């Protein structure tokens, strides 16, 4: 039953057992119906933590690989372990991207949901690009960019500048430009515009989310300050 799976997923989250949490929300999604806002968050939170652990481990091992130049045994061990981590990471994001293509994006009836899932598609293709091989990379990068761009156009047409999903998309899209495309000027332009447009419209704030929109705005400016150094 769906509500049993959602109820167990909440249990897994409280236990910080995010593989369990993701398995339950994957099963819910595969039932084919549009996800509730509560179910959507639980799915997003579950896989964010599942992929985040691999991304963090990857950063550690890849940095070790780079500081063991001239240490043949150590470098080859780190390289093989990084590739082991990468395989786990790719399977996770392919599972998410499959759920997005087959259920989440086609079932999204509202503009807010479309922006959310298209941004999620951009996110998990970005994670694939972080670890992609030479000849696969450009195609993966273009897939992330196209998902972000479509979400970006819908968000600018249907949401107010202070909407946290619109702001969160601008945050991650700017991060994509800085970290994946190595285009700091476009990254800072995108982030600065999103911040300024939200400042111009502070009247479009709800009690439920005004806290979340100002937190993202601070993150936007923090990145702006870091990238300007």
């Amino acid at each position: 039953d769906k509500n049993e799976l959602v109820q167990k997923a909440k249990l897994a989250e409280q236990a910080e057992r995010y593989d369990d949490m993701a398995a339950c929300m994957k099963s819910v999604t595969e039932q084919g119906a549009e996800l509730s806002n509560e179910e959507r968050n639980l799915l997003s939170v579950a896989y964010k933590n599942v992929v985040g652990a691999r991304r963090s481990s990857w950063r550690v091992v890849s940095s070790i690989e780079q500081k063991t130049e001239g240490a043949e045994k150590k470098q080859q061990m780190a390289r093989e372990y990084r590739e082991k981590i990468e395989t786990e990471l790719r399977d996770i994001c392919n599972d998410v991207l499959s759920l997005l293509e087959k259920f989440l994006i086609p079932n999204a009836s509202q503009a807010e949901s479309k922006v959310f899932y298209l941004k999620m598609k951009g996110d998990y293709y970005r994670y694939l690009a972080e670890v992609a091989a030479g000849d696969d990379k450009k195609g993966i990068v273009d897939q992330s960019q196209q998902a972000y761009q479509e979400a970006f156009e819908i968000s600018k047409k249907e949401m107010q500048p202070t909407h946290p999903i619109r702001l969160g998309l601008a945050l991650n899209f700017s991060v994509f430009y800085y970290e994946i495309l190595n285009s700091p000027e476009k990254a800072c332009s995108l982030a600065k515009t999103a911040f300024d447009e939200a400042i111009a419209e502070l009247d479009t704030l709800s009690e439920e989310s005004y806290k979340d929109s100002t937190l993202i705005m601070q993150l936007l400016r923090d990145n702006l300050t870091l990238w300007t150094s």
Partner: peptide
Amino acid sequence: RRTNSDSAL
């Protein structure tokens, strides 16, 4: 890495 994405929330 000091750059932050939405995951920081």
